[PDB]
Design a protein around this nucleic acid. Structure first.
Lengths: 257, 120, 204
RNA sequence: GUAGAAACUGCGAACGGCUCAUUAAAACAGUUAUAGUCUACUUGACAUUUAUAAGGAUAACUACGGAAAAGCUGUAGCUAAUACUUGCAUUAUCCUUUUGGAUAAGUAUUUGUUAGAAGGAAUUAUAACAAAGAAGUAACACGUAAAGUGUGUAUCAAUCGAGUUUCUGACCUAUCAGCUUUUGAUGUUAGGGUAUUGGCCUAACAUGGCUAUGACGGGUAACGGGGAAUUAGAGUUCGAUUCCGGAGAGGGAGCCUGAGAAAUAGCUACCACAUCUAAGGAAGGCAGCAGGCGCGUAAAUUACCCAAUUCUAAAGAAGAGAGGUAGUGACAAGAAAU
């Protein structure tokens, strides 16, 4: 037959997974989740090759059996949960919160997060639809549908959704003074203010982003993430702080130890 | 015989209620030493009163002797030992014995027992 | 030749061994389900009326009803017919069968009595064996005991000690689940009303 | 309570693994569109026209058998379920204006008539009216905060995808120069059909479409690609082969179930083979992991185990010739005694 495929070869493991060539034959194909397979990783990989909590897949299963891992302040049990672009994952046995961030080098990395700021996740809505009786709903990259949004919120804005009540708090728009992340660009991991946009008739629209070192780059409109306005990046960025570090002077920094 | 103990990447895992690290034992001019000796030494190191709560594995002595790289695991109690582990490493440690050793004969007999061809 | 005569009202059956052709002759050219008096089959079986209800032919092939032929004719079998055992969901197989018509081809005949005659058969029309399973559903046991909804029937179950577990009970946990669904529905209505009211508030 | 074979049911079995005969703008790759569709599991929002708990219908089993035999089967009695099937309020809106009164009651899908947050452009979202009308909204089981979960159900969206589809790209050959068009060739109109669109097909009407920028043909000891061999740089040659995609399971044809198969360790029919056969009749596909015959110069064990990866399910404790290890191994490659 020609049904939906159910395996991924180890060589065909996605780019940012960073899995060894000889360590077996197959990598897990994430079950249908809230985020795309090409841009999210399973919790098994996340806690194995980064957290290093266990040494075998079955040990990871035994960990997952206890209702200790939590996503968006609620319980999850299936070993194939892609964490997604932005979220919060909580572990109560150690009372530690992790939040998924990127690197200027193009990967996924967990970031230690305190309890107060661990209750806030930022979601970029992807679609705006109208339902029966004039109620407007927003569909997010998070695979989450938020009904009854403000008339203020537009398509590309980002929304301060609370984890527990499942309700909006505030909106953040996309002026030339709004901090935006790049999701899957070849220059992924750069934090900038965006100098301006460039809308093209019936095609992709290219937006220019400016950095803290006056570097200017361009990116497709599809894969941007409103993270905060000119005041500050609202959430805690990783150690690299989202500024991309040039190769030669990066080698200089590495050499100078 | 004397030796030196070195522990790398000592990290405690509350989720398994265990700990992990790499064992580097220096025994110059003396061949590979038994695991019981270093078990006693590490018990005294970490103030451990029982011996059956330690798992050791992957002890490669490397070319030339005088060094040994290995990975060590400690347990909270025998309950955790029997709880968060499979049976083969426990067999190697010396707490339980192995199961039936037919192998693939179990599956061969399962296929042989064609359903509703055997009244029992 | 081998007649399995069964009494539906006594849940028992008995095997009778006959050989003569003309003895079984009076059952000829009759479809399955016909009304025939089993007189020539035995000295005491006279008077008995039998509804011809099963048989098996010379080489072991079964009988059917719809196929009113006279020989072996292969045909299509479905998932839910009366003489097929599928190996997979929706699997079908063609299997040789013998037609409904009765002839000189049968290894055995399964017959049952519909009207009592005159004589008696040891262990067939005298004794009886019960259901060998007690009723389990609440309505079934309530109907078979005639004690309506006055008291629980859980104390009036047949002993093999060990008792079957009555279904369709009146459990307080069932009541609690019902009240939980009701209250959850009303709470959900409350939350949706709050959301729409605050949406009206934020409209301007 | 702890457990429980046999059993009905759910789910997978449509994944994987193997091979390359057919394939010469077909596949394949890059790059679109789907404003022309569907979409299992999961996740998130969330619904409309007897109840102190409703009806039968049957397995395993018990009892008589039968044939040689197989994944064979009749009558009698039964009983169950989250299998099958009937079926238990209420929500929204307007006037005086917390609140009194008045009012409306169909989700998809289909047809007819109007208006009309987004996209670039709607016959979009949606609202009103006239109609039809599915499938439901819990009659199912367990136990967490010092109320919860499981199973299952209507829609929307995402997910894991698939199907059509634009554009650009190839081996040799003219001792293949004119092809296609009664049997759809090219297009228009209307319809059937499919999940959507279309000569996909039907009826009518038109006479059209390709071509020395090499069509139509013929060969290919031709699966396509990222790749491999050689490089001063250009190039030429191999590409079955770790992976992506395509096709196939003897070679055509057909078909049920199932979301998803024109599936082959599912079925049906033909031929060619070939097995067992009490001679009446049954069942077959190693181009799956091992091994046998035949072919040829040419190619390894009828080994061990799911311990590693990862899959399936009622998902920790069970299977996995996917796969790992062992065995044979002067295919190649690297280190280094005499």
């Amino acid at each position: 037959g020609k049904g939906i495929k159910k395996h991924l070869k180890r060589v065909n493991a996605p780019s940012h997974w960073m899995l060894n060539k000889m360590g077996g034959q197959y990598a897990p194909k994430t079950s249908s989740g809230p985020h795309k397979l090409l841009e999210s990783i399973p919790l098994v990989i996340l806690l194995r090759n980064r957290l290093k909590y266990a040494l075998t897949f079955d040990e990871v299963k035994m960990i997952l059996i206890q209702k200790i891992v939590k996503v968006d302040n609620k319980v999850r049990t299936d070993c194939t949960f892609p964490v997604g672009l932005m979220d919060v994952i909580h572990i109560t046995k150690s009372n530690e919160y992790f939040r998924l961030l990127y690197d200027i080098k193009g990967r996924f990395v967990p970031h230690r997060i305190t309890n107060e700021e661990s209750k806030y996740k930022l979601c970029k809505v992807k679609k705006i639809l109208l339902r029966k009786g004039r109620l407007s709903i927003a569909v997010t990259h998070d695979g989450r549908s938020i009904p009854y949004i403000h008339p203020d919120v537009k398509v590309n804005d980002t929304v301060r959704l609370d984890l527990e009540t499942g309700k909006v708090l505030e909106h953040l728009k996309f002026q030339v003074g709004s901090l935006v992340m790049v999701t899957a660009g070849h220059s992924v991991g750069r934090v900038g203010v965006i100098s301006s946009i460039d809308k093209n008739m019936g095609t992709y629209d290219i937006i220019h982003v400016k950095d803290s070192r006056n570097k200017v780059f361009a990116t497709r409109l599809s894969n941007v993430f409103v993270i905060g306005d000119n005041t500050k990046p609202y959430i805690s960025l990783p150690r690299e702080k989202g500024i991309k570090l040039d190769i030669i002077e990066e080698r200089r920094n590495r050499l100078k130890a | 015989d004397q030796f030196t103990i070195r522990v790398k990447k000592y990290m405690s895992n509350p989720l398994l209620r265990r700990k992990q690290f790499a064992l580097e034992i220096l025994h110059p001019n003396k061949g590979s030493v038994a695991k019981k000796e270093v078990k006693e030494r590490l018990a005294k190191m970490y103030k451990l009163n029982n011996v059956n709560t330690i798992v050791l594995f992957g002890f490669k002595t490397l070319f030339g002797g005088g060094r040994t790289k290995g990975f060590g695991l400690i347990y909270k109690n025998v309950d955790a030992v029997k709880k968060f582990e499979k049976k083969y490493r426990l067999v190697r440690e010396g707490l339980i014995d192995k199961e039936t050793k037919a192998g693939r004969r179990a599956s061969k007999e399962l296929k042989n027992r064609r359903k509703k061809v055997r009244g029992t | 030749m081998k007649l399995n005569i069964s009494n539906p009202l006594n849940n028992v059956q008995k095997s009778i061994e006959i050989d003569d052709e003309k003895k079984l002759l009076p059952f000829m050219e009759k479809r399955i389900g016909n009304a025939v008096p089993g007189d020539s089959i035995g000295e005491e079986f006279t008077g008995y009326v039998f509804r011809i209800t099963g048989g098996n032919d010379k080489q072991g092939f079964p009988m059917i009803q719809g196929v009113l032929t006279n020989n072996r004719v292969r045909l299509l079998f479905k998932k839910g017919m009366k003489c097929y055992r599928p190996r997979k969901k929706g699997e079908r197989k063609r299997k040789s069968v013998r037609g409904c018509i009765v002839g000189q081809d049968l290894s055995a005949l399964n017959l049952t009595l519909v009207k009592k005659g005159v004589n008696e058969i040891p262990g067939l029309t005298d004794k009886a064996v019960g259901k060998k399973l007690g009723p389990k559903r609440a309505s079934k046991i309530r109907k078979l005991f005639n004690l309506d909804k006055s008291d629980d029937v859980r104390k009036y179950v047949i002993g093999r000690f060990i008792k079957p577990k009555i279904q369709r009970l009146v459990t307080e946990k069932r009541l609690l689940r019902k009240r939980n669904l009701l209250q959850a529905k009303e709470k959900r209505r409350l939350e949706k009303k709050q959301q729409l009211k605050e949406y009206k508030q934020l409209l301007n």
